[PDB]
C-alpha cells in the first residue's frame with residue numbers, strides 16, 4: 550500500500566478507558582492492569598471490556614496509523630463512531646458503529662455481523678489502519694508481511710465523527726498481558 554503519507558499521530562483518551570487499563574505517560578501505550586486503576590467512574594468509560602478510544606475525532610479526509618500487537622493472544626482494533634454505547638454488553642459490528650478486526654483463540658476475524666474469517670499466512674506484529682472518510686472505506690494491512698491487505702470494509706455508513714478504537718483483551722490465560730502500542734511515524 551501507498552497510504553503511509555496520510556500518517557496521523559494518535560494518542561489515547563484516558564477518560565474513555567475501562568477502569569482497569571494503564572495508559573503510558575506519552576498516551577501511546579495501553580495494557581490491562583491486574584486490578585482497578587483507582588480512577589473515578591464517568592459516562593465515557595467502557596464498563597464491560599478492556600477498551601479505550603483515541604482522542605482524535607475524524608469527520609473528513611484520509612488517515613493512517615500503525616499499532617504494535619507483539620506477543621498478544623487477543624485484541625480488537627479499528628475505528629468506531631464517537632456515539633457508540635459505552636455500558637453493558639454489545640457486539641462489534643457496523644450496525645453498532647464499529648469497523649474492527651480481531652485476534653481470538655488463534656484465529657483472525659473481521660467484525661462484520663456475522664463475523665468474517667481472515668486469511669493471514671504471517672501472524673502480524675504490527676497492523677496498519679487506513680480510513681477514507683469520503684469513500685466510506687476502512688482497510689487493515691499486515692506491516693510484518695510487507696503491508697499485505699488483511700481486510701477492507703467498503704460502503705461504510707460512518708454516520709458521525711470517528712475515533713480510533715482499541716481493545717487490549719482479557720488476560721485469563723496469563724499470556725495476554727502485553728500492551729497495544731501506537732508505532733512511531
Ligand SMILES: C[C@@H]1CN(C(=O)c2cnsn2)[C@H](C)CO1
Pocket residue numbers: 567568569596597598599719
Ligand atoms: C473489564 C474490566 C475488569 N472487570 C472484570 O470483570 C474483570 C475480569 N477479569 S479481571 N477484571 C470489571 C468488572 C469491568 O472492567
